[PDB]
């Protein structure tokens, strides 16, 4: 289902494993920005959907901190899964950097993605 | 800094614990929408912050699913930690809800929150 | 450029006039949700663009009241203008309903959609 | 009502004609940014409103060229006025700068903001 390698249109990829748990874990790799190599993430999900044919509820976090770079940021992710021949996640995101309460009023991107398997 | 007790004016409140290895880990309790009891929380945070006076990043996720209900739904939220005297964290929150291809544009919505410790 | 007819893969539609003045102005309309006919729009864009091959920003609002009908709601609509042989307005949106103080937390949801013209 | 002059936490200032219409006209000036002097606005509100004591829907937006300065951005405002001995309007928004397609994913910023009368 969720479990597997999946992809962007901008060429990052992430790999997780799905549990029974209704958690998520694994790793984020960034094809842009002040990132180098992957990264960790973790998440929840809805492990008991419904039937009426409506998506799968998930989400998930990443800092930007690993043994190569520290960029002083975290994205998380908000979204679902929809399965079939051609499964798909369809999410919007955000993304906030440390910053001076002076500066506050610039901490933080949003926009949306779409991963494929 | 972050570990401990938290509240917003909702009155919903959340437990949480920092570790060294950068994860955040606890639970929250909503006091709004169709949720009674405790949910779990994970996600993690910038564990090596700069000194020039800047808060630290953070991120967490719940999903709406314990023992007691399922609401087919999950909230995030985004932002950071500020310290000192009065110590805070200030975020943006994205919730998205399952639903059919024909509904997906009415699917998310988004607000924002600021918690106060202890 | 921007003036013109466009449309989204929901099947909504809009035409406009975009200015020298740097004001839009035109009419909207839904093909989802709680409206019927056309509804009046209007925004401002930058009418002096950098040359590097970035795009040119924009913005726009519509509030779902005509003489049909009344929604209670607002739209808002924040973007940029991408021209060339297959132009495109890429954005992201806010819709915003009246609700009483308690229910604050639940009345905007946040979306993204592409437009294209003729 | 919603006629008059607002201000916001940061030292920014509004002000706005509401017509029988159903639009909004004024100018903004920004204490942050980069920006300089005021600025063209335009929106549209509720004019028939519930009585059950919700609030009045809204929205307005802005571009960042004037006579002193162009930003190649523009915000848009969404939110609603709450009336009484102390009004407010409460809103989130959106601003985009122009890009290449390269840096599209960084181009729009989200917050929210409290004016008040
Ligand atoms: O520059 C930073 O602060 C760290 C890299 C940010 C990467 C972002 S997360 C949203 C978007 N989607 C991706 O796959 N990468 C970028
Ligand atoms: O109703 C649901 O779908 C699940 C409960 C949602 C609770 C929300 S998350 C955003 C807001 N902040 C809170 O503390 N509670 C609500
Ligand atoms: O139902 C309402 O409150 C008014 C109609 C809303 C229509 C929305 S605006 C976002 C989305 N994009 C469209 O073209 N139509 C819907
Ligand atoms: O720097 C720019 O691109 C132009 C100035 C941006 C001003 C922004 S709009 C959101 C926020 N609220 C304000 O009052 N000012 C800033």
């Known amino acids: 289902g969720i479990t597997g390698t999946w992809?962007?249109?901008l060429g990052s990829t992430f790999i997780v494993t799905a549990g029974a748990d209704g958690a998520l874990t694994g790793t984020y790799e960034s094809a842009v920005?002040?990132?180098?190599?992957?990264?960790?993430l973790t998440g929840r999900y809805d492990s008991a959907p419904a039937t009426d044919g409506s998506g799968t509820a998930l989400g998930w976090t990443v800092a930007w901190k690993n043994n190569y770079?520290?960029?002083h940021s975290a994205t998380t992710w908000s979204g679902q899964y929809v399965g079939g021949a051609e499964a798909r996640i369809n999410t919007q995101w955000l993304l906030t950097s440390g910053t001076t309460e002076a500066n506050a009023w610039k901490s933080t991107l949003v926009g949306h993605?779409?991963?494929?398997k």
Chains 1, 4 share one sequence.
């Open 113 to 116: 993605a779409t991963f494929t």
């Open 7 to 9: 992809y962007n249109q």
């Open 33 to 40: 920005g002040n990132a180098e190599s992957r990264y960790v």
């Open 69 to 71: 770079r520290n960029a």
